Amino acid sequence: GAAWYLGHMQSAANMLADKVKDADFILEIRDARLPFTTENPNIRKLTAGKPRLIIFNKAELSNEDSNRAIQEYYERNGAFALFTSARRCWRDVVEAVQRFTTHILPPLPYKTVAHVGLVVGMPNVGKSTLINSLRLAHEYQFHREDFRRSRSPETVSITPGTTRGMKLVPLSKDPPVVLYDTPGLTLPGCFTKESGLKLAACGIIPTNDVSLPQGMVARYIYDILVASGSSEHMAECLHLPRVPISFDDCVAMICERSGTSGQTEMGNLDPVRAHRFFVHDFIMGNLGKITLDVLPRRLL
Amino acid sequence: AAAAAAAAAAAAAAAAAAAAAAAAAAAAAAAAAAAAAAAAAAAAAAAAAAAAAAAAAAA
Amino acid sequence: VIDDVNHALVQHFLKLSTNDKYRQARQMLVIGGRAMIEELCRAGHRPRHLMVECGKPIPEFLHDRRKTDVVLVDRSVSVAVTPGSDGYVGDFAIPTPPMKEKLIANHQRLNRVLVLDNIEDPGVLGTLLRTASGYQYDAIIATNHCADLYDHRVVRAARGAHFQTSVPIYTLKDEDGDDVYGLLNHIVERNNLLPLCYIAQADAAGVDGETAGTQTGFVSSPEAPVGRVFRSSVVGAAPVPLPAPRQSDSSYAASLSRELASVSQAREELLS
Amino acid sequence: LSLQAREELSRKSNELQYHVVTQDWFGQRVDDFVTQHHPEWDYETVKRLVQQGHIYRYRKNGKKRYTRLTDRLEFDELVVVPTASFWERQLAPPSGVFHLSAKTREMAQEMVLFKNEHVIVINKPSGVPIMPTHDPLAMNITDLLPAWRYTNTQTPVICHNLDTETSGCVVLARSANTHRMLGRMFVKRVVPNSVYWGFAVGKPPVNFGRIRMHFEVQKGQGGDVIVARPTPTADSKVGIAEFVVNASALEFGSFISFYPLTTRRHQERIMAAHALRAPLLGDAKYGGESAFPHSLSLFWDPARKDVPLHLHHRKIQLPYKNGAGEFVCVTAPLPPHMEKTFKRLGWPVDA
Amino acid sequence: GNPVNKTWFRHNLIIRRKGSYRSRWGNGTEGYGAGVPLSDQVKLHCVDNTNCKHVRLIAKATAERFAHCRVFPAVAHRVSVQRFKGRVKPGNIYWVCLFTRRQTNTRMSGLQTNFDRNTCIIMNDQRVPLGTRVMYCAGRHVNHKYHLKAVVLANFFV
RNA sequence: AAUCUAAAUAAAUAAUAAAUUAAAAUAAAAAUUUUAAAAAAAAUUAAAAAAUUAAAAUAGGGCAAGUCCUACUCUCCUUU
RNA sequence: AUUGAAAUAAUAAAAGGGUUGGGUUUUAAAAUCGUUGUAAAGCAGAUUUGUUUAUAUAUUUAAUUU
Structure with missing residues (x-):
């Protein structure tokens, strides 16, 4: 029974505060295709004053018009924002944390202590892989905890479960900007009817099951893109009469790599092999490089 | 079957109540149990005094 | 707090206030009144x-x-189930008088009876019930099709009368030919077992003894007349009793402005 | 305990020391000495202190003779019997130191499946809570309790708090003496003592097994998970159930039977929402977001909150037995909301 | 103690008949009580005019035959269309009024019978059909007042 | 469906304290019970099943020391 | 004073089931080789005075008839 933290996030607030009461610079790993669904609910009232380094991953597939406003929004509030294609990997995102403190850090009173970094975000959007990439390499090349790297028991090699107490990853050394873990507080599974669509749309929570069939997100990625064009160019990419009238033809027109047991005279193709295609291809930013969220021009 | 033979879950004869604890033969074949008053496994099912009626509490 | 007219307790009172079959089937009757409830509550109800x-x-x-x-x-719902300006409404347990004391313990002299024969109207019907009792009349009676003596308008008019403050009232039956020619014979002739009769308070009046009684009563004259009708019919003449005195008024009065004039002094007090 | 006997040694209190005079009281049983000198404590309140050790000892010689209630006194040793007077302090002294209209006193009597001189078993309606949450407002069982006081017993005591959305069978004890006994029947079983029925949507893994999850209640409502296969050992307790999928909708639902060996919070529903990730039908608190009712041919109008959680506390094996030797097993029949989906599926609802 | 029985619930909703040279199913083709009441997900064909696949409709209940009395079965059935139109969903649980079956079911007049494909029609909770028209030949066993007074009694029976 | 009897000939193997038994019920011993006791009435023979009898004071968690392990600043007899 | 250390993750041997608590369970080729029960000793003109009963369910439905 290996589930995760399960409960409304708006009750994980007064405990998140005392976690920020001691931290210095707040981080976050989001998805630029989902500027405010991958955010914790308090992002508004979370800190308002600690220097946030809010990062949007997979930005190369998120649209560029909505990228400007979301950039200058926090950039007006003061809290910074950085967008990355992730092809140039987190190694450059790490470089940001080397630069995005030297300019904004308050000078350390004691020459070598830390810059205690509070990280948040969904573990499946890039926050896990960002920790366990810097957490694994610290075991070999050593900065603190000062022991001979032998006491890690059998079958762990990593510990993001059952201890996660004072556990923290030293990302840098001379400006030792360390980073916390924040035991995963996001995607509560009590999500909204629609948020699970935009979440499974982006490849996040890639589970497509009885809880969320392909034909429920595929109906969503089709009806979101009612403007046929540069998306019908993916349809026209597979012999489609450009405009699809509705969900029946376009999904059935793309059954060239789909099908099941059908007669030699009347073929009864398979619309689920066409479902996953239309679903999973939009995940790759292949069909269109367009966001999902609405980007409130107002403050909210 | 007239001759009978429909024995209960065990008890044979139960004596008078004498307050909360009522006796019972529990004839079956052996016992093991305990005892609230002095807790020692006490094979002697030939006589088990239940508490108010809870078969959980005995002798 | 019940802001719904579909509530069981609401639909309870309606079918208890207006319907009359499913009234006795539960032996209940709706009472309205802020002080009218305590009046009944005072005497153990x-x-x-x-x-x-x-x-x-x-x-x-x-x-x-x-x-x-x-x-x-x-x-x-204070408007719907409650025709009545009270913010204080309830329901009570139907009492009953026994249909045998009309037939056996008919006491001889001070026995004046009321009848009230017609398809009546609440308010008026309730009013007479208050005043007839208001002078300790015995054996107040029903008819073919008068309104139920526990109707919500009747109990609002009776104003504490229906319950046994002092009320030996009675209710009568339904007979064969869609009529009540057998309602009288079963009791009314037996209500001449004790002797005298009258038929006043009918819009039309005949013999009209007309409020002219001289002698203080020959006080030991153990017979005494009975009640009256509402409309004009000779149904009161097909019964065996040969008394026929249909009384009227004197001045320009009209309906309902005849009885309370008559019953006022045509009651027991012939001693004056 | 070694510290409990310390403060007992270092407490003046008033330490009502009680001599045992030559004539009247030397020889009498101690429980006679206390009960005719201290009329304030009930006799049962006097047995607890005399046996518990927060006792009225007796002191003759240089040590304290803690005693059973029947130990008799000594031949005028002026053998003082010390009794406690200001227990309140670090001691933490022991236990003992609207109106229900009709349509309720009747409603609470159709919810009775079994009654004898020692318990009362009821059939709780799915959706009525037990503890009050809107402290003046909610109609719960504890406010109803002075309705099952059949035969004028003293306000039955609730024994195991069924949850809000959980339907089913409850047990009250009719006697504060029986309630002490009926504790060992609930907490942390080894073998099952109760059956929970439910309609989880989605055929789980193998239709027999045991679930061991390690719950952790972070306030508010954190509700954590397996995190440690052994335990976090500090804030975690485990909840074990032996589930059996009695029958199964072919691949989209199942009728599961849980035998909850433990007593953890929503352990039925949180372990059901991660036996497969197939939660119970209408479980909007832990699962419940797959769809509104998880999108079936059931009553599907409001849905968003229409379908009540198909979870039912089905059977409890009481320890009181019956005229025939069998122990008694209440069999609270399913609510219509489960009788809906059982007959809509044609299963033989076993009452 | 005494693990008296596991699942115990299939035995309440299945027609289990021992095999003991006297109790035994048989292939049909012997007499009434033909055999094999078709107990699993069997993917019946739909026949009435809807978007039920008419080629696939997956089974729910563990019993289907008239010598097992389809006349009071309340046989649930789940719809699994391999395609409907690209009006029902491919995910709902409708009852079914079984029409015929390829299994050679012997009648009580020796009239053996078997059709090209086992088919059925979806109906509702009040036992009313969901379609307007039916495209197959039903079996005599659909004559009960159970599935008549709402069933169109489509056309030529057998 | 198909192949693998029996009897005839030939003959090994592990095992073996012996019983006067052994059906069946039923209480009695630091005990775990091989017996004994009351109460019963339990027949030969061949065949086939393995319910019982003839093959370890164990499995799983929670603790603490130990051997194994790595590491040398301080230890002993190394030889090379 | 005279070597000093490390959850040295596994082994071993112990205990145990305000500091303090998770675990609940018992086996892997069986000529049966003692009882057991199952069947049997092959044609009896013929059940059954009395032994002994693996014998086993009493209802979840549908459609009528007042």
Whole structure:
């Protein structure tokens, strides 16, 4: 029974505060295709004053018009924002944390202590892989905890479960900007009817099951893109009469790599092999490089 | 079957109540149990005094 | 708080206030009245479901198991199930008088009876019930098709009369030929077992003895007349009794402005 | 305990020392000495202190003779019997130191499946809570309790708090003496003592097994998970159930039977929402977001909150037995909301 | 103690008949009580005019035959269309009024019978059909007042 | 469906304290019970099943020391 | 004073089931080789005075008839 933290996030607030009461610079790993669904609910009232380094991953597939406003929004509030294609990997995102403190850090009173970094975000959007990439390499090349790297028991090699107490990853050394873990507080599974669509749309929570069939997100990625064009160019990419009238033809027109047991005279193709295609291809930013969220021009 | 033979879950004869604890033969074949008053496994099912009626509490 | 006219307790009172079959089948009757309930409550009677309207007047002189369900009701249902300006409405347990004391313990002299024969109208029907009792009349009676003596308008007109403050009232039956020619013979001739008769208070009047009695009564004259009708019919003449005195008024009066003139002094007080 | 006997040694209190005079009281049983000198404590309140050790000892010689209730006194040793007077302090002294209209006193009597001189078993309606949450407002069982006081017993005591959305069978004890006994029947079983029925949507893994999850209640409502296969050992307790999928909708639902060996919070529903990730039908608190009712041919109008959680506390094996030797097993029949989906599926609802 | 029985619930909703040279199913083709009441997900064909696949409709209940009395079965059935139109969903649980079956079911007049494909029609909770028209030949066993007074009694029976 | 009897000939193997038994019920011993006791009435023979009898004071968690392990600043007899 | 250390993750041997608590369970080729029960000793003109009963369910439905 290996589930995760399960409960409304708006009750994980007064405990998140005392976690920020001691931290210095707040981080976050989001998805630029989902500027405010991958955010914790308090992002508004979370800190308002600690220097946030809010990062949007997979930005190369998120649209560029909505990228400007979301950039200058926090950039007006003061809290910074950085967008990355992730092809140039987190190694450059790490470089940001080397630069995005030297300019904004308050000078350390004691020459070598830390810059205690509070990280948040969904573990499946890039926050896990960002920790366990810097957490694994610290075991070999050593900065603190000062022991001979032998006491890690059998079958762990990593510990993001059952201890996660004072556990923290030293990302840098001379400006030792360390980073916390924040035991995963996001995607509560009590999500909204629609948020699970935009979440499974982006490849996040890639589970497509009885809880969320392909034909429920595929109906969503089709009806979101009612403007046929540069998306019908993916349809026209597979012999489609450009405009699809509705969900029946376009999904059935793309059954060239789909099908099941059908007669030699009347073929009864398979619309689920066409479902996953239309679903999973939009995940790759292949069909269109367009966001999902609405980007409130107002403050909210 | 007239001759009978429909024995209960065990008890044979139960004596008078004498307050909360009522006796019972529990004839079956052996016992093991305990005892609230002095807790020692006490094979002697030939006589088990239940508490108010809870078969959980005995002798 | 019940802001819904579909509530069981609401539909309870309606079919208890207006319907008359499913009244006795539960032996209940709706009472309305802020002071009219305590009047009945004073002489040992507790409403089953006392529905106060949700508001200010909340006297609790019998609370804490006043035969509870002391429900607070919305203004909206205070209009529907309650024709009546009270914020204090309930329902009570039907009493009963025995149909045999009309037939056996017919006491001789001071026996003046009322009848009230017609398809009547509440308010008026209730009013007479208050005043007939208001002079200790015995054997107040029903007819072919008078309104039920527990109707909500009747109990509003009776104003504490229906319950046994002093009321040996009675109710009569339904007979074969869609009529009540057998309602009288079963009792009324036997209500001449004790002797005298009259048929006043009919819009039309005949013999008209007309309020002219001289002798103080020959006080020991152990016979005494009975009640009257409402409309004009000779149904009161097909019965065996040969008395036929249909009384009228004197001045320009009209309907209902004849009885309370008659019953006022045509009651027991012939001693004057 | 070694510290409990310390403060007992270092407490003046008033330490009502009680001599045992030559004539009247030397020889009498101690429980006679206390009960005719201290009329304030009930006798049962006097047995607890005399046996518990927060006792009225007796002191003759240089040590304290803690005693059973029947130990008799000594031949005028002026053998003082010390009794406690200001227990309140670090001691933490022991236990003992609206109106229900009809349509309720009747409603609470159709919810009775079994009654004898020692318990009362009821059939709780799915959706009525037990503890009050809107402290003046909610109609719960504890406010109803002075309705099952059949035969004028003293306000039955609730024994195991069924949850809000959980339907089913409850047990009250009719006697504060029986309630002490009926504790060992609930907490942390080894073998099952109760059956929970439910309609989880989605055929789980193998239709027999045991679930061991390690719950952790972070306030508010954190509700954590397996995190440690052994335990976090500090804030975690485990909840074990032996589930059996009695029958199964072919691949989209199942009728599961849980035998909850433990007593953890929503352990039925949180372990059901991660036995597969197939939660119970209408479980909007832990699962419940797959769809509104998880999108079936059931009553599907409001849905968003229409379908009540198909979870039912089905059977409890009481320890009181019956005229025939069998122990008694209440069999609270399913609510219509489960009788809906059982007959809509044609299963033989076993009452 | 005494693990008296596991699942115990299939035995309440299945027609289990021992095999003991006297109790035994048989292939049909012997007499009434033909055999094999078709107990699993069997993917019946739909026939009435809807978007039920008419080629696939997956089974729910563990019993289907008239010598097992389809006349009071309340046989649930789940719809699994391999395609409907690209009006029902491919995910709902409708009852079914079984029409015929390829299994050679012997009647009580020796009239053996078997059709090209086992088919059925979806109906509702009040036992009313969901379609307007039916495209197959039903079996005599659909004559009960159970599935008549709402069933169109489509056309030529057998 | 198909192949693998029996009897005839030939003959090994592990095992073996012996019983006067052994059906069946039923209480009695630091005990775990091989017996004994009351109460019963339990027949040969061949065949086939394995219910019982003839093959370890164990499995799983929670603790603490130990050997194994790595590491040398301080230890002993190394030899090379 | 005279070597000093490391959850040295596994082994071993112990205990145990305000500091303090998770675990609940018992086996892997069986000529049966003692009882057991199952069947049997092959044609009896013929059940059954009395032994002994693996014998086993009493209802979840549908459609009528008042």
